[PDB]
Design an enzyme around this catalytic site. Structure first.
Site, short mmCIF file in Angstrom:
data_model
loop_
_atom_site.label_atom_id
_atom_site.label_comp_id
_atom_site.label_asym_id
_atom_site.label_seq_id
_atom_site.Cartn_x
_atom_site.Cartn_y
_atom_site.Cartn_z
N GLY A 54 0.83 -1.21 0.00
CA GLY A 54 0.00 0.00 0.00
C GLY A 54 0.86 1.25 0.00
N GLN A 55 0.24 2.34 0.41
CA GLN A 55 0.93 3.59 0.72
C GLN A 55 2.10 3.38 1.66
OE1 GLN A 55 -0.98 7.84 1.83
NE2 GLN A 55 -0.84 6.38 3.51
N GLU A 56 1.88 2.61 2.71
CA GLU A 56 2.91 2.40 3.71
C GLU A 56 4.14 1.68 3.14
N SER A 57 3.95 0.83 2.13
CA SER A 57 5.10 0.23 1.43
C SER A 57 5.98 1.27 0.70
CB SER A 57 4.65 -0.84 0.45
OG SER A 57 4.21 -1.98 1.17
N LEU A 58 5.42 2.45 0.40
CA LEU A 58 6.22 3.57 -0.17
C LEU A 58 7.18 4.19 0.81
CD1 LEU A 58 3.58 5.39 -2.34
CD2 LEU A 58 5.65 4.10 -3.06
#
Ligand SMILES: Nc1nc2c(ncn2[C@@H]2O[C@H](COP(=O)(O)OP(=O)(O)O)[C@@H](O)[C@H]2O)c(=O)[nH]1
Length: 160
Positions: A54-58
């Site tokens: 997700g976003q958090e993987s960015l």
């Protein structure tokens, strides 16, 4: 006093696996400051759980959570051929992190109840697991709904 990270795409079977692990054991949610990670304590093992991709993987703010992790459990939905490349990318980013140098790697090839799912051999090939030399690893077929295969994965961790 044992610390395990459990990761995988949304819908892979993580929470179902932790339910199975928790049956007939003492279990509670340990409070975490963020909304990214969920901490589930089962007996004397702290499981830190989050969804990848997700976003958090960015950002991977959860790498603060790698410190002192004994095992990384990666849950793979064996039916999700479309998205397994995402899991692969994230696996290797984790394995590159210096704070996970000591961790063992358990891959649960979940949803093996489902017809036409990828085989364990195919998942292993896709993920290039034979390339992993600096971490000890095991891949294990399971069905989290019934628990089949989960005890084998647990034993592998306990053997180490
Ligand atoms: N057929 C099948 N469905 C599963 C299996 N494991 C989990 N599920 C289902 O897949 C969905 C997502 O599982 P969940 O544990 O919530 O995934 P999470 O998002 O990784 O925590 C739920 O509807 C589960 O009941 C499995 O081994 N076989």
């Amino acid at each position: 006093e044992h610390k395990v990270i459990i990761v995988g795409l949304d819908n892979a079977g993580k929470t179902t696996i932790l339910y199975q692990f928790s049956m007939n054991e003492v279990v509670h949610t340990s409070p975490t400051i963020g909304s990214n990670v969920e901490e589930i304590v089962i007996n004397n093992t702290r499981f830190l759980m989050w969804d990848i991709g997700g976003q958090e993987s960015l950002r991977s703010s959860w790498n603060t959570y790698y410190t002192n992790t004994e095992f990384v459990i990666v849950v793979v939905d064996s039916t999700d051929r479309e998205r397994i490349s995402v899991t692969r990318e994230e696996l290797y980013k984790m394995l590159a992190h210096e704070d996970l140098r000591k961790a063992g790697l358990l891959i649960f090839a979940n949803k093996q109840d489902v017809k036409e799912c990828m085989t364990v051999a195919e998942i292993s090939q896709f993920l290039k697991l034979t390339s992993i030399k600096d971490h000890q690893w095991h891949i294990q077929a399971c069905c989290a709904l019934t628990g089949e295969g989960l005890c084998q994965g647990l034993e592998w961790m306990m053997s180490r």
